[PDB]
């Protein structure tokens, strides 16, 4: 719907932030991928919070 759509991931697991730089997420949460350049991706959750989550708990979500 936009020329540059937002990219999303779905978490496979519950993950609890170990510090305030990481982002706690739940299994099946949908997360905006803000930065996937490293092993820890910066993502944003539905509440607008952002932080880092491990790449390996995330599955890419297909564009509509």
């Amino acid at each position: 719907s936009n020329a540059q759509p937002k990219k999303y991931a779905k978490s496979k697991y519950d993950f609890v932030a170990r510090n305030n730089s990481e982002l706690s997420v739940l299994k099946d949460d949908i997360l905006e991928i803000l930065d996937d350049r490293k092993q820890w991706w910066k993502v944003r959750n539905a509440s607008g919070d952002s932080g880092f989550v491990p790449n390996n708990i995330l599955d890419i979500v297909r564009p509509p």
Binding site: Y13, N19, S21, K38, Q39, W40, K42, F52, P54, N55, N56, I57
Partner: peptide, 12 residues
């Protein structure tokens, strides 16, 4: 469950 990758974000 998967082991976490090494941290590669910056902290403080």
């Amino acid at each position: 469950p998967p082991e976490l990758p090494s941290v590669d974000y910056n902290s403080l």
